[model samples]
Target: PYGRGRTESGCYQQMEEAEMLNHCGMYLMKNLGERSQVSPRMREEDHKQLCCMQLKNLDEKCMCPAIMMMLNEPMWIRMRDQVMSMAHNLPIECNLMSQPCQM
Candidate 1:
């Protein structure tokens, strides 16, 4: 799955709504460094709004396809140093949960 091609069909699992929100939150955290690509400094409100919009409109089951696309791109994974950082609680901020979500 970590290689350079499409993950075969059976390798993907459909997630429940809560898991989708959790993964979405993780995805946004991964994008934090890219915010400047959209604007020099994106506002917190704008970030929350766009994240909620993504949740509202994208088909819940399509996450795997989007992830596979990301796999084809150049990305670094310094394995041991890649410890997942803290929960920013983006989902809680967006009214999706009461507690901090971690990925």
Candidate 2:
């Protein structure tokens, strides 16, 4: 009667996803600057190139979700629309995606 067996696996997966998200967040901040300092000026080719490298290191499925998570942060609340467009475009900009994510 190992009915809870799947639960353990699910929790482990969630932990791994959380770690990936944390790494993604740090990568963004490192290249783009912290939330308070982030700006359109930081959106240059060099910064994008660094971010693209990090994106390639992450799981393809987690790419969009990592961006979505950033969009949800309070740091971007006022500029949600702008952030959403830019963040979601990262994958496509890096040729990681054929198109932007639906959400």
Candidate 3:
């Protein structure tokens, strides 16, 4: 029933929402596993895909007004609330079968 920019990802796209969160998770896991000094690799693709998918999800839910409200909130105020709200849904969506390349 989804169409016109509503279809789920095709197999060919190298990165996906599910994968970014998985990579973030793995990065934390490594930190927690041994308190490693290495930092998580940040990439343009990671932020791009994350925001794109988030906005698209909000688009689907007709939450455009809520987003507009967010624009009015102070940066830190909004960040604390939303950073986890949107990110948590990803874990329930898929198992972490594949992940990003090491930098």
Candidate 4:
């Protein structure tokens, strides 16, 4: 069991590291979304959640980063054109002012 335990321990450690990285990437992407005005709304949220949220803190410096990261996600990658179009069209879609978004 000694040698078996050592092998299993290494596998578990690697799995932990991968899980950590996955979550880190998720939060990093969310932060990018929050800062960029790309949309704080991810697949995690429903349309009602996205629609009802406030946007008083969006910024331009954050915008492109968020949008770019969003397009990198698997689901969004397939919808890249639509996502880009949405970023450009958000203000119109929401009936809000354009970039440098206000509440």
Candidate 5:
């Protein structure tokens, strides 16, 4: 409901895709301010193209190994194996769904 009336609770999930992204973009901009050490004003543009190319240099350069077992293996299986393999390298808590995707 981009232009639709707001929910009584004022929750964002009640908003339409356009409104959802608009608010989400604002959150991202504010979060960036903390990590970038820059408080540059966010653009008022209505759209942005998100893709692999937008990743930072470190993120872009990280290895993304791929494993294939038959044609229909689930992503979770791959993710589980990947996470298990690297769990020792990191001390932070990790989960299957939040694990990084392999290229």
Candidate 6:
């Protein structure tokens, strides 16, 4: 009974959002993997630029939630606390204007 009017477009919108979130997660992983043993500020700069480039096409509202979801994934369980704090700060670092997700 999901076929109330507009249901088709609603489902498509949900799918698009999911795809965008997945894209965000992939870029975040790329950012994490590129971390280096350089100065902290330098690392932040690299992460910010790289993330901004990869996510330039995503809707502004999707940024924080995507990061929040990535933090909770099983792959990050061991470093969840540390990574969560870092990931939360990425929005501010990128100047995305979206508030970072809180614990």
Q: Rate the local accuracy (lDDT) of all candidates.
A: 0.35, 0.46, 0.32, 0.34, 0.25, 0.45
Regions more than 4 Å wrong, model 5: 1-7, 16-19, 22-32, 37-103
Among all windows of ten consecutive residues in candidate 2, which has the lowest summed lDDT? 1-10
Clashing pairs in 5: 1-16
Candidate 5 per-residue lDDT over residues 1-103, each given as its tens digit:
0011222322222222113123223333433343545468753432233211121111211212111111012322433343333322221121211234432
Per-residue alpha-carbon lDDT of model 1 for 1-103, expressed as tens digits?
1113344442123323223333444344455444445545554332345445544443433333433322222332332122122222443354433232223
- Candidate 3 residues lying further than 4 Å off, grouped into runs, are 1-46, 59-63, 76-103
**Candidate scoring better on lDDT of 3 and 5:** 3
Model 2 accuracy (lDDT, Cα): 0.46
Q: lDDT by residue for model 3 over 1-39, one digit each (tens)?
A: 111222233321223322333333333233334434546
Mind giving the per-residue lDDT tens digits that candidate 2 earns over 26-72?
A: 44444455445655666422345555665666656545545555445
Sliding window of 10 residues with minimal summed lDDT for model 5: 63-72
lDDT tens digits by residue: candidate 4, 1-103:
0001111223223323232122323333353454444455644432322321332123323332333443444544543454445444453344322333332
Q: Which stretches of candidate 4 lie over 4 Å from their true place?
A: 1-60, 91-97, 100-103
2 or 5, which is superior by TM-score? 2
Order the candidates by lDDT, highest first: 2, 6, 1, 4, 3, 5
Q: List residue ranges in candidate 1 displaced over 4 A.
A: 1-46, 58-88, 99-103
Candidate 6 residues 4-98, lDDT tens each?
A: 12112232243244442233344455555665567555633233454555444555544554454445445555445555555555555664424
Which residue pairs in candidate 2 collide?
Answer: none
TM-score of candidate 2 against the unseen true structure? 0.45
**TM-score versus the correct structure, for each prediction:** 0.27, 0.45, 0.24, 0.32, 0.16, 0.44
